[PDB]
Design a protein around this ligand. Structure first.
Ligand SMILES: Cc1ccc(NC(=O)c2ccc(CN3CC[C@H](N(C)C)C3)c(C(F)(F)F)c2)cc1Nc1nccc(-c2cncnc2)n1
Length: 270
């Protein structure tokens, strides 16, 4: 793009500079393909495409966020179709499958704590920027080298999720107020993070195992909560339970959650 042009957008890039390849993850992520940013011999993920409106809205949002633990936008091709959104490629894929397939001797308790800590840092940042994630879960996180974890948003509800409020929501990761009044806030993200902590502590088990979705709400309303997973430190579980406070205002903020994790991780890792 012309730096002098009235329409200059530093994020627009040459579609030709990308060598699109196979769909990413057997097509589990939808219209996202593996690609190579020629000029750098770099593997990247390229999401392509009247969801053109929603699409551009996503691109615009991604240009406003930068954090070491949030998937990194690398560039866009929204000059003309086909529209593109390019981000970095994370070597080991989504956190859910990673937890299920890892070497548990390698991904030990210190590492699980490290992952939680990185995720809360990303969420603390989003909190600060007044952004609401809406679908925080392990399936929406990426893992890189050296147990690097970044929060992403793959818009999976259209690709766990069940018909609800017109749309499709992951009932087991959704806060009560969100299920009841469709009220989404950073506090409902805080509830989802708690469930995510449970997913990590269990190396990727599905939440409320065996419990049918239709009973979840009522159960939550009657104060039922998932039990401390085997081997999950009491302090962590204590954090899970606080994130699951029935009233959002009673749930801790991400800054506070991050704070608590930093403390714990350094204590175990030293
Ligand atoms: C190609 C691509 C295009 C757009 C995004 N967007 C976000 O993650 C993405 C979009 C929007 C937001 C934020 N908004 C603001 C509020 C809004 N909600 C919904 C109301 C969400 C986020 C963030 F992480 F910040 F949460 C991420 C990510 C990828 N990357 C991508 N996609 C699938 C699989 C892989 C992949 C990479 N490496 C290895 N294997 C797989 N990479």
């Amino acid at each position: 793009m012309d730096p002098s042009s009235p329409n200059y957008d530093k994020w627009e890039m040459e579609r030709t500079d990308i060598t699109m390849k196979h769909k990413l993850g057997g097509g589990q992520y939808g219209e996202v393909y593996e690609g190579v940013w020629k000029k750098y011999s770099l593997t990247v993920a390229v999401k392509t495409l009247m969801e053109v409106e929603e699409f551009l809205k996503e691109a615009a949002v991604m240009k406003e966020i930068k954090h070491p633990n949030l998937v990194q936008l690398l560039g866009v091709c929204t000059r003309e179709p086909p529209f593109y959104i390019i981000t970095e490629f994370m070597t080991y894929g989504n956190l859910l499958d990673y937890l299920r397939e890892c070497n548990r001797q390698e991904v030990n308790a210190v590492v699980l704590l490290y992952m939680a800590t990185q995720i809360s840092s990303a969420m603390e940042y989003l909190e600060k920027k007044n952004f609401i994630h809406r679908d925080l879960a392990a399936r929406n996180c990426l893992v890189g080298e050296n147990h690097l974890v970044k929060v992403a948003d793959f818009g999976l509800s259209r690709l766990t999720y069940t018909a609800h409020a017109g749309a499709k929501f992951p009932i087991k990761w959704t806060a009560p107020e969100s299920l009841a009044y469709n009220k989404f806030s950073i506090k409902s993200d805080v509830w989802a993070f708690g469930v995510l902590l449970w997913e990590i502590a269990t190396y990727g088990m599905s939440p409320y195992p065996g419990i049918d979705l239709s009973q979840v709400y009522e159960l939550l309303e009657k104060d039922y909560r998932m039990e401390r997973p085997e081997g999950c430190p009491e302090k962590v579980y204590e954090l899970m339970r606080a994130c699951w406070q029935w009233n959002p205002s009673d749930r801790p903020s991400f800054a506070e959650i991050h704070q608590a994790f930093e403390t714990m991780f350094q204590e175990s890792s030293i």
